[PDB]
Amino acid sequence: TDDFRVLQAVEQGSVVPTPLIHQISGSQSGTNRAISDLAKYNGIDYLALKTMLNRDYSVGNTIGVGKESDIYRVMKIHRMHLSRLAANKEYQFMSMLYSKGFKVPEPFDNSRHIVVMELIEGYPMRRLRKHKNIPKLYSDLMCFIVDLANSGLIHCDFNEFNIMICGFVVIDFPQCISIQHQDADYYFQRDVDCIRRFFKKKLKYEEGFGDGYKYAYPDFKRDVKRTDNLDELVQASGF
RNA sequence: UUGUAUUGGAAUGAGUACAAUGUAAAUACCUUAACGAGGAACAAUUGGAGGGCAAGUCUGGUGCCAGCAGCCG
RNA sequence: UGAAAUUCUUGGAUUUAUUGAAGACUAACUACUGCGAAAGCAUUUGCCAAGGACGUUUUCAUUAAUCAAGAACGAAAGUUAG
RNA sequence: CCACUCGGCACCUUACGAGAAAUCAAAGUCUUUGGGUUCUGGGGGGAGUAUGGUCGCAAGGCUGAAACUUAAAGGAAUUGACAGGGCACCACCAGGAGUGGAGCCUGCGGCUUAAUUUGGAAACUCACCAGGUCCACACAAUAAGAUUGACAGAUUGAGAGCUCUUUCUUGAUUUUGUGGGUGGUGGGCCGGUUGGUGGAGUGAUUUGUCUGCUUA
RNA sequence: GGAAGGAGGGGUCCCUUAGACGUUCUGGGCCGCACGCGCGCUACACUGACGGAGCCAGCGAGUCUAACCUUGGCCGAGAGGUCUUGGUAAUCUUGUGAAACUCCGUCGUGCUGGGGAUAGAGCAUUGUAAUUAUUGCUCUUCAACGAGGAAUUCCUAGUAAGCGCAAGUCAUCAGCUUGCGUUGAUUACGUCCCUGCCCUGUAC
RNA sequence: UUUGGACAAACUUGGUCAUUUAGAGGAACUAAGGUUUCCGUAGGUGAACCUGCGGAAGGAUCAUUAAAGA
């Protein structure tokens, strides 16, 4: 792949004149083997896959498609330059959280705006109706929010569209913000209120929280103690 | 009176040769009896046809390779 | 200083006043002005010797031009001794 | 202060002239080529390097190559690619109705399958799948009977006087082998923009097409 | 001031030929579905559902070539059937007596009398043929859904949105496309913040 | 055969310079980011990029200034 890898590595030397293909790249055979493979937005995609193909053993199958990224043991690919930046932020952000006790999918690798992660077994929370032990489950979703607030971060949309099924795992973190943000409490109470609505409406439910614990549910000025300042490792928002 | 293709008589030395001439003796030249043209097989080559620099938008092959190219290519 | 730190200071820093010492430099006036072979030369007064231009009804009478060899001077930095 | 004159540092005007041009009182009086005299260059690198000499306390100065390598390196002057200001509900602002969440209809991708054709489908449409019938020219043999048409009935998963039981009708319109294929065969016609004459320049360029004030 | 200080018209010489880039019949598929993306229809109820009564449009299209659009009488719970009739159409169907809507009652906030998917039994209509089921009617069955995250579409006046009708295709078959009318708001009358387009130093 | 003399080929042993060749043995040795731009001199960094003193443009000039009859 060295005839292709160098063909990409020379691309940083900057349009592109025809002579760049003759003297910018490195000869007999080399000036022909590029065509022998080359004969069989897009190129920075269709060929740029080659890095993983070498460094990474099944091509798998299609699974999902989205407005800004596409999804195919699971691989994630972003959508000419900035796409490589976004992928790097995501990879290190996830990696960081997983090194703590947080229940998020394990990252395995990242290259050239491509990321690879563990594939979750479960099913989406939004269609759960019959879990055998809802009282403990309520408690443990509440405690999860407290942990993040301790470490310094607030999820923006911690709700049933991004939890999968303590057996739950959290599958994405769009537009997270730091605990220092001026609106931190306003978003915090939304997450608590959103999770209360679900357990009341569908499950009828209404040290820990809820029944059997001496405090009903968390509150922003309680149990938040600036433990770890992970919001400085990734400058999420609000310095 | 000028071109393009079926047909007919004429002319001649390359070569061979009696002789004489030539020469110290010879060979050859000059002269000459006999012989010696119809794919007149008694068959002209050496370099070129992008430009410099006279002369091909012809037809088949090949794969930046084999090669061409004083220089630009 | 863009921001700041090292530093100096209640035995008084920075700032104010009256005096003194040392070494260097010569503002404004100063310009489409001057002098010198070039490098270069700017406070006052004195001494020493030189120079161009101008004026000339003075003197000599070709004594001249350019120049290998050879010779004097030559910013700043640099070398040796006080 | 006014007029004149010699010498000097400069300036403005002028071009018989000069030059590749920028420009030039000399960079003029040069193919119409000769006033006197000193020094230096001969495409770009290697290289102000190596070596010898000479000067200096030293740092260094002066003099000064070749092997080899390369098609350009260089001068002057023209034209001109890839911040502002304007516009729009396929942009926003103020808002309305929403879509995205549920059930179902429908289009595309993927999966599956013998096929799920290709990119207002029950037959036909139809292009897809399984299984059945039926159908040139040029040489050698053949015929007055080469061949053509037709009642009633019949054969398969899918059938008919182009097959078959029975047997009439008709006449050279043609039949069986063997030799290259030629073609109702594949790969002729449509759907904001410039010059003339004049001016400048050796040219490529330039003016016209503008300093200022208006409009989509 | 004033009806109005407008809206629209790049494409079409070579090779190969016996049943050869064929003819035709029966049956199947195009409708299969763990899933991904997108345009839609119906709802989550009281500004409502159900029952009775009131009662109003505009743009189309229709047979002799034969059988199109159908009034009126009779039968049937209904879908539907049957005997006649007008129109080659500003003339007849047709005042297309459309729906939302208005008035008087029942229901009482309970996945309820909201919502009607999935499914069983039976009766009809088109067609040569309805099985994997065109469509219609009757009784029974009674699912999700308690106003919807990140994202994202259209829109400045008889306009958005609500409601229905006609035509197209068409033996039958619409939740589709185009047009028409009925009821009829809120919020700007601006800007370059976001998205996007356009115009006016240097040999690069 | 022999004395002396002039002419004078050439020989031997040391020194020195140059060259040919066998030939060690080794070193080899080679191949396969700046942002004004510069000159001389001295110092510094692995490294263009840094610092002291003197010099050049081969670097893009807006605006304003005196006026005469006893």
From Swiss-Prot:
Residues at the catalytic site: D157
Q: Which consequence is recorded for altering Y138H? A: In RIO2-1; nuclear export of ribosomal 40S subunits impaired
Protein kinase domain ranges (all copies):
57-176
Alphabetical UniProt keywords: ATP-binding, Cytoplasm, Kinase, Magnesium, Metal-binding, Nucleotide-binding, Nucleus, Phosphoprotein, Ribosome biogenesis, Serine/threonine-protein kinase, Transferase
The places in or outside the cell where this protein is found are: Cytoplasm; Nucleus
Q: What else is known?
A: Present with 10300 molecules/cell in log phase SD medium.
What the protein does comes down to:
Required for the final endonucleolytic cleavage of 20S pre-rRNA at site D in the cytoplasm, converting it into the mature 18S rRNA. Involved in normal export of the pre-40S particles from the nucleus to the cytoplasm. No longer associates with pre-40S subunits in RPS19 disruptions, suggesting it acts after the ribosomal protein in 18S rRNA maturation.
Instruction: Say which family it is in.
Output: Belongs to the protein kinase superfamily. RIO-type Ser/Thr kinase family.
Q: What is this protein called?
A: Serine/threonine-protein kinase RIO2
What organism is this sequence from?
Saccharomyces cerevisiae (strain ATCC 204508 / S288c) (Baker's yeast)
> What is the organism lineage in this UniProt record?
Eukaryota, Fungi, Dikarya, Ascomycota, Saccharomycotina
Which stretch of the intact protein is present? 13 to 330 of 425
